Design a protein around this ligand. Sequence first.
Ligand SMILES: CC1=N[C@H](C(=O)O)CCN1
Length: 271
Amino acid sequence: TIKIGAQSMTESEIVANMIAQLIEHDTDLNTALVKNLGSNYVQHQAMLGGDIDISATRYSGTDLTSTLGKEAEKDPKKALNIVQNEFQKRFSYKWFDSYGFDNTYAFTVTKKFAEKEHINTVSDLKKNASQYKLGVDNAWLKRKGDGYKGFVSTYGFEFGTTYPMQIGLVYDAVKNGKMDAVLAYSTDGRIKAYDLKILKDDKRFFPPYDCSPVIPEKVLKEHPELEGVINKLIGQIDTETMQELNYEVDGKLKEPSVVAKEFLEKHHYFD
Ligand SMILES: CC1=N[C@H](C(=O)O)CCN1
């Protein structure tokens, strides 16, 4: 039975279910979901411990700056290449090419706030930063490399008050005027659904966050038919598609298993 890890994100659950169903459609392997993994660190430790055989969703800039303890590379291709080579060298883990989307931190505001405050870029926030409330996830404030400390030293300012919360809550918090700005995830469907504005990262502070599955070479060796299944999804999901899938769960309240199934059926399980 292949143990598939899902991080505590709607996106991770959708993709974990998608992998599970594709594996069972194509092969005689049974699968199990290991859900609610709190962070990439928890995912990685679970893989080191053999608690999971597959990480459904890992993000290049995230593991680059934490797991690998490296500078935040700003080029998508170079960042992916470093992560892939390092995962092979250090762990004999295969970090696959991307599904096709980058899920980045994105400073997000209502269009009303942007018009009132004259905001197009992250640097535009500087003039009144002390007046703003910023909603962020439960980890970003303490992250090294791509975290708040790095943000401050690059952009040269702090927000008046920063509020860490479950990432799922930031979209309503900003829509409802509770926060002036939130550090959202760019693949969340509620950004488009709520007509929000993503601010340009004008100093290119954030590294890329291309999303890929990760699987130990040992697992791929034990189950030679596994790589071919995973290959079917590589390059097949762009951001717009990911946003739509995310919204199926977060806006329409559908089970990730159901959303995954419907996606696979539409694409005839990629043959
Ligand atoms: C920028 C980003 N952060 C998440 C995290 O830090 O695990 C993963 C998906 N996107």
